[PDB]
Amino acid sequence: GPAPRVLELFYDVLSPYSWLGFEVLCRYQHLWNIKLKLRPALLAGIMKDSGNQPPAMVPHKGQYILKEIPLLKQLFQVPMSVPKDFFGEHVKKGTVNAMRFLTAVSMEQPEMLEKVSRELWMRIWSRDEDITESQNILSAAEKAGMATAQAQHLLNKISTELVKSKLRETTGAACKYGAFGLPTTVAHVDGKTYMLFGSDRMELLAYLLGEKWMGPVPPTL
Amino acid sequence: GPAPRVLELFYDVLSPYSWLGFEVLCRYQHLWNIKLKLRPALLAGIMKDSGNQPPAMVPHKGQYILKEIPLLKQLFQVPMSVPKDFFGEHVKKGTVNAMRFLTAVSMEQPEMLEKVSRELWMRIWSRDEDITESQNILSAAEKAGMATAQAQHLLNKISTELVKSKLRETTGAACKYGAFGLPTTVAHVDGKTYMLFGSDRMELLAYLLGEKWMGPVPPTL
Numbered sequence: 001g002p003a004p005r006v007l008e009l010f011y012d013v014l015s016p017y018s019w020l021g022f023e024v025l026c027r028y029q030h031l032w033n034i035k036l037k038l039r040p041a042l043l044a045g046i047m048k049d050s051g052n053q054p055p056a057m058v059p060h061k062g063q064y065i066l067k068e069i070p071l072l073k074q075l076f077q078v079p080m081s082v083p084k085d086f087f088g089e090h091v092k093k094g095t096v097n098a099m100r101f102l103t104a105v106s107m108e109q110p111e112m113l114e115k116v117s118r119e120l121w122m123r124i125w126s127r128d129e130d131i132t133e134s135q136n137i138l139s140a141a142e143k144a145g146m147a148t149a150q151a152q153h154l155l156n157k158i159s160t161e162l163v164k165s166k167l168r169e170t171t172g173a174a175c176k177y178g179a180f181g182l183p184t185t186v187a188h189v190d191g192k193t194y195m196l197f198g199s200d201r202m203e204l205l206a207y208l209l210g211e212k213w214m215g216p217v218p219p220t221l
Numbered sequence: 222g223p224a225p226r227v228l229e230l231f232y233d234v235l236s237p238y239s240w241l242g243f244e245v246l247c248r249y250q251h252l253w254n255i256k257l258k259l260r261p262a263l264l265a266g267i268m269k270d271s272g273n274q275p276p277a278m279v280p281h282k283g284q285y286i287l288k289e290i291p292l293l294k295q296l297f298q299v300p301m302s303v304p305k306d307f308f309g310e311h312v313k314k315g316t317v318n319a320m321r322f323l324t325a326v327s328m329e330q331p332e333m334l335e336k337v338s339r340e341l342w343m344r345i346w347s348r349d350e351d352i353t354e355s356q357n358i359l360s361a362a363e364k365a366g367m368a369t370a371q372a373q374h375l376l377n378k379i380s381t382e383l384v385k386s387k388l389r390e391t392t393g394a395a396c397k398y399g400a401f402g403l404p405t406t407v408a409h410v411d412g413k414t415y416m417l418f419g420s421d422r423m424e425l426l427a428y429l430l431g432e433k434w435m436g437p438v439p440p441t442l
């Protein structure tokens with residue numbers, strides 16, 4: 001049939017909404033005529049370029065997010081839980097090491113990107129564990145089924161210039177597309193380019209794609 | 222059968238997303254076991270009684286909104302078109318008048334609230350006409366099917382203290398629920414209270430209610 005439409009998903013494991021958007025597209029890549037391309041980006045890098053302000057700046061907005069997540073995780077069926085101090089410890093510690101590792105993985109082990117991204121989320125957004133320390137990142141990759149030698153090998157590269165600039169490029173591409181936050185999904189359909197922000201634009205995306213929307217947890221074939 | 226669940230929708234005709242959320246709930250009040258209670262509120266008051274600035278302050282973000290509206294109007298099937306001087310004209314001015322009239326309508330002519338609200342949006346958000354002048358607001362009420370004498374009568378009360386404070390009270394109730402923008406929908410289900418922001422949370426609202434989601438334009442049959 002018709003060539004699949006390419007979907008570029010820009011995300012940062014630091015983001016709970018990115019994990020929601022990510023699981024939804026991951027589920028639909030076996031149902032819609034699409035080709036999912038995972039693009040590891042840095043939220044901080046995107047908020048920096050886009051000159052975007054902290055969505056928490058507003059007391060009711062930040063509060064709202066923390067009360068919303070526990071409801072959305074049920075709908076989307078993603079085992080996540082609001083950290084003990086998200087806006088404090090995880091956000092300020094950062095994700096550069098994680099995002100750079102995922103970048104290395106997308107360059108050398110593209111078939112593991114999905115699972116390793118999921119494991120890093122399981123740590124920070126499911127078990128409130130740390131994902132800034134090499135041995136922790138390494139544990140995530142190993143749970144994702146990656147061999148210890150291979151994981152360590154990629155980890156050794158996150159300090160490389162190839163990987164460092166690959167991350168900066170990938171997050172610059174998202175801004176060039178107009179990104180101002182994550183998740184950002186860019187859909188390439190019949191010569192057109194759509195940029196959708198958030199994990200609640202998957203139903204609009206189906207419409208633009210001419211695909212059928214069946215909820216965040218569509219029925220497996 | 223179980224008593225219907227009350228859904229409170231806070232909206233301001235100034236808001237294009239409030240109109241989207243508004244039409245969605247208006248179409249589902251015939252399908253879901255719910256009771257829709259339209260609550261006219263003033264965005265500006267919500268923006269103040271919460272300290273939340275206009276979302277267009279982030280350059281990349283205002284642009285996203287104006288590009289997204291044309292796509293969402295199709296999905297939702299709502300005849301809207303983006304104004305010209307949205308800022309130094311429609312917004313800079315205000316809707317205080319239109320929201321006060323809608324408040325008077327909700328107090329004396331509750332069965333016309335829906336239609337009149339829909340006609341005021343048709344003006345500002347569909348034909349880019351004005352809705353700050355009495356004779357204009359009047360025109361909206363007439364197209365809604367409201368007799369000119371009745372409409373004029375209500376218009377004469379928008380200066381009253383009853384009406385003025387009713388609008389302030391209603392928009393304050395939104396803030397007490399945690400509102401930081403519009404549309405804000407508050408669902409009361411089994412003793413629990415959910416506050417959902419946006420026209421893109423109806424699919425989560427359906428899950429919380431135990432109802433079936435069938436897109437922004439459910440099968441009226």
Ligand SMILES: N[C@@H](CCC(=O)N[C@@H](CS)C(=O)NCC(=O)O)C(=O)O
Pocket residue numbers: 014015016017018043052055180181182183197198199200282
């Ligand atoms: N409404 C979106 C919210 C997504 C969101 O708030 N993402 C955060 C990072 S986890 C962000 O990038 N925000 C930028 C903004 O709100 O302008 C959803 O339901 O997924």
Ligand SMILES: N[C@@H](CCC(=O)N[C@@H](CS)C(=O)NCC(=O)O)C(=O)O
Pocket residue numbers: 061235236237238239273276401402403404418419420421
């Ligand atoms: N993504 C939401 C956006 C709703 C929105 O942007 N609402 C505006 C008024 S029209 C607001 O009150 N924004 C406050 C904010 O974004 O913090 C939707 O699809 O409804």
